Structures are given as C-alpha cells and as structure tokens.
A paper describes a structure:
Immunoglobulin E ([name]) plays a central role in the allergic response, in which cross-linking of allergen by Fc∊RI-bound [name] triggers mast cell and basophil degranulation and the release of inflammatory mediators. Omalizumab is a clinically approved anti-[name] monoclonal antibody that binds to free [name], also with high affinity, preventing its interaction with Fc∊RI. Mutations were therefore designed to disrupt two recurring packing interactions observed in the [name] crystal structures without interfering with the ability of the [name] to recognize [name]-Fc; this led to the successful crystallization and subsequent structure determination of the Fab/[name]-Fc complex.
The structures reported here were the result of unsuccessful crystallization trials of the complex between FabXol and an unconstrained Fc∊3-4 molecule, but similar crystals were also grown from crystallization trials of FabXol in complex with [name]-Fc. The arrangement of Fabs in the FabXol2 asymmetric unit precludes the propagation of the second, β-strand-mediated interface throughout the crystal lattice by a single Fab molecule, as in the FabXol1 structure.
Author numbering:
A (entry chain H): 1 to 136, 142 to 222
B (entry chain L): 1 to 217
Write the structure that this text describes.
C-alpha cells in the first residue's frame, strides 16, 4: 500500500526558509506521473503550489513563483519542497500529493498526512499536562494541555487502544499568545477502579511527549 | 487563473436526504470531450479524499451514493442519501490548466434529532495550583444542535471575560457536538472563593442545568 509520510514542519521565522520532505513507501517515486505540494490555510481553502513530473519537469504557482523549489531524490524515494523569504501568509498545512496518469493528470488520489508550518517570530514553548479527574453510570475524565506554542498538539488515549468516546477539542489562543486544549473521554463508572487511563500528549515543535495517567483524586 | 465558486457555502440536511452541491468555473474546463472537474471530501484532521474525477467518474472505493455531473463551467456533486459519516467539507477542483485551483469548500452537516448535553464540571488539579494558576473546565458532551450557552458563577457572581469555549466537529458516530468551557483564574483569586458553578442552557433542556462543586470538598 502506497504511503506518503511528511516531515520538516514546525516554526519558522519570517523571512526564513522551510524544507519539507515527503517519504514514499510501498511505491516507487519514479513510477508516479507527478508529485505535488498543496497547502491549506484557514479561509483560503486549498492551493496547489508546485509539481514535478516523471521526467523532471517542474512547475509552480505564480502566487509563490520566485521563492519555491520542488526537487526529487530517487535513491531515498523522497521529494522535497523548499521555500524561502517566508511571510505570515505562508502559514498553512502543507500536503504532498501524487498526480495521475489518466484523465488530464492533475487530480490527486494519494495524499500525505499534512504538516503545519507556522511562520512566526515568537518562540517555541512546551505544554503542561494536567489531569481532569473523574467525579465517580458514565464517568467523564480527561487531560488539560495548557500553554504551548505553536500548533499542533496530538492527543491519544492508552497508545490508541481507547478511541470510543474520545473528544479532543480544537485549541484556543489565550490572551498570553499561547495555545491550550483539552481532551476528554466518557467511560463507565464501574471501570474507574481496574482500568488505567493514560493520555498521550505530543508537541513535536518543542520535543515534549508526555503520558499522563488520570485517576480519581 | 480559473476561479471556482461553490454553492451553497454550507448546508444542514436531515440524515438520508438528497444533497446537491454546485461548482461554477470562471472559464470552461472542457477538453476533447472530457470535463476536467474533480471533487474531494475532507473530514476533520484528514487530508482531502478524491471522490470524482473528470466530472462524472467515481473513484475506486468511494460509495456509489456519490455522483458527479455537468460540463463546461457548471458542475454538480450529488449525494443520493446523506449518511452520518458524510459530514465533511467538499471541494471542487479543475485540472484543465495550471495553476490547478480549488473551490472555497462546502461544509455539509447532518441534521439529527435534538439531544441534551451531559454536563460535567472539573475542579483544577492540585498539580496546576502549584504553578499559581487555576483552570476550571466545564464539559458539555454529545448534544445537538451545536448551539449551546454556558456561563460561570463563582459564589453566585456571574463571571465575564475569564472563560473560553471550544466546540468539536460533528461526530459521525451520532451526529452530535461536544463543548468545553474553561474558566481561567489566578491561584490567589481561586482560593478566595468556595462555590464554582457551571450553568448550561440548551434547546433540549427545559430548565438550565447547573453543576457545581465546593473548593476543598
């Protein structure tokens, strides 16, 4: 099965440069008709910015032309995106995507997971994880991920074993300039003694990974 | 460039109903008998998923309730019968010429029966109080519609300007929403009071439901 895995996202200074990579597995990069980069910013939908065909022909969106370079490395089965002179408007989730050999080519059936590039002059900051202890039927518990920058933070429960009833709320921007979110889950009250609940928090921009157990106070 | 405009911008349809989304291109996307209009489905946190290519061809693996039609500048995406898992933002995309452009997106929500929220209140953890800040969280779980009002009361005193709300996306499992309200206070301000209440008013609730606790009890 073809998989596209992205890396290189995170915080970049205004006027700095980004370097993203899209590692392709289960599929040879030389076999795709084209490999593309597509970014998604809030209020701007989706925007195609760059492409490279199987013969090495490159093409770019005029809205970014002059500060963008898409390249390829067949030996590593990876293609890259390079942008410089970054502006705050370049803040977006960047996707890599494969074109088609059929029906006009430039539609995309295979996508990466997307990585968020934040163009800001502020500093990175790791979050603090606090428990939302249950009261003691259906019980509610969760974790509080407070004061981090920039986005994103991923939260799972019991290394992915617990997914039912999970609600990870979108982050909110506090007046201090730092983000904060919480993740909850509904569990039976009779399970509060016996079942262990651990929220897995990950903030890659600060290299902060925390496993916090939530138990009654 | 070719600009795509979708209509409507959003819609809320009863489950099982027929859904029609239109896309108008500023120029024709026809070429040699084919129409190069494509449709994507994007669910929260996921990359866009290809549904339709060349205006009317169904991508492999996509349920047959999705279909596309149209030619030239006008195109239609049809869901024959809306299912709970079809909650997403839908995009059209032309592949007739570069730069390959997308529509602004159409958010599709499932209209279900009115459901009351399960209200839970969480006192600040002792681990957080050591840092000098208190966060009181009030959870509204699995309700519909998305419209819910929450207001805090600290010793019968209505709070204002010290809370933030975050709403989840519609859950495909039951077409419900979840809301969290986070009351942020300083540790000193938190220790000077006793009763912390969360008052919730919703359409599915005849009388407003209030959950509270006593600090240190």
């Amino acid at each position: 099965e073809v998989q596209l895995v992205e890396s290189g996202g995170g915080l970049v200074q205004p006027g700095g440069s980004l370097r993203l990579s899209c590692a392709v597995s289960g599929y040879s990069i030389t076999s795709g008709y084209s490999w593309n980069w597509i970014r998604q910013a809030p209020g701007k939908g989706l925007e195609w910015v760059a492409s490279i065909t199987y013969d090495g022909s490159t093409n770019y969106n005029p809205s970014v032309k002059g500060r963008i370079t898409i390249s390829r490395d067949d030996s590593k089965n990876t293609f890259y995106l390079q942008m410089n002179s970054l502006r705050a408007e370049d803040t977006a989730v960047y996707y890599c995507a494969r074109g088609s050999h059929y029906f006009g080519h430039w539609h995309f059936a295979v996508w990466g997971q997307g990585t968020l590039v934040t163009v800001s002059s502020a500093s990175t900051k790791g979050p603090s994880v606090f428990p939302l202890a249950p009261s003691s039927g259906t019980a509610a518990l969760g974790c509080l991920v407070k004061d981090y920058f920039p986005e994103p933070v991923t939260v799972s429960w019991n290394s992915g074993a617990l997914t039912s009833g999970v609600h990870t709320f979108p982050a909110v921007l506090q007046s201090s300039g730092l983000y904060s979110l919480s993740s909850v889950v509904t569990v039976p009250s009779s399970s509060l003694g016996t079942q262990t609940y651990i929220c897995n928090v990950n903030h890659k921009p600060s290299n902060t990974k925390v496993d916090k157990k939530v138990e009654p106070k | 460039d070719i600009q795509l405009t979708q209509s409507p911008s959003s819609l809320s349809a009863s489950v099982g109903d027929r859904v029609t989304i239109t896309c108008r291109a500023s120029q024709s996307v026809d070429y040699d008998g084919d129409s190069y209009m494509n449709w994507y489905q994007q669910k929260p946190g996921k990359a866009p998923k290809l549904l339709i290519y060349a205006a009317s061809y169904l991508e492999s693996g996509v349920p047959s309730r999705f279909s596309g039609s149209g030619s030239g500048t006008d195109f239609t995406l049809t869901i024959s019968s809306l299912q709970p898992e079809d909650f997403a933002t839908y995009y059209c995309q032309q592949s007739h010429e570069d730069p390959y452009t997308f529509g602004q997106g159409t958010k599709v929500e499932i209209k279900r029966t009115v459901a009351a929220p399960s209200v839970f209140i969480f006192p600040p953890s002792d681990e957080q109080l050591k840092s000098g800040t208190a966060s009181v969280v009030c959870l509204l779980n699995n309700f519909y519609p998305r419209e819910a009002k929450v207001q805090w009361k600290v010793d019968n005193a209505l709070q204002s300007g010290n809370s933030q709300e975050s709403v989840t996306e519609q859950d495909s499992k039951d077409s419900t929403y979840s809301l969290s309200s986070t009351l942020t206070l300083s540790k000193a301000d938190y220790e000077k009071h006793k009763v912390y209440a969360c008052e919730v008013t919703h359409q599915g609730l005849s009388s407003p439901v209030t959950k509270s606790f006593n600090r240190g009890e």
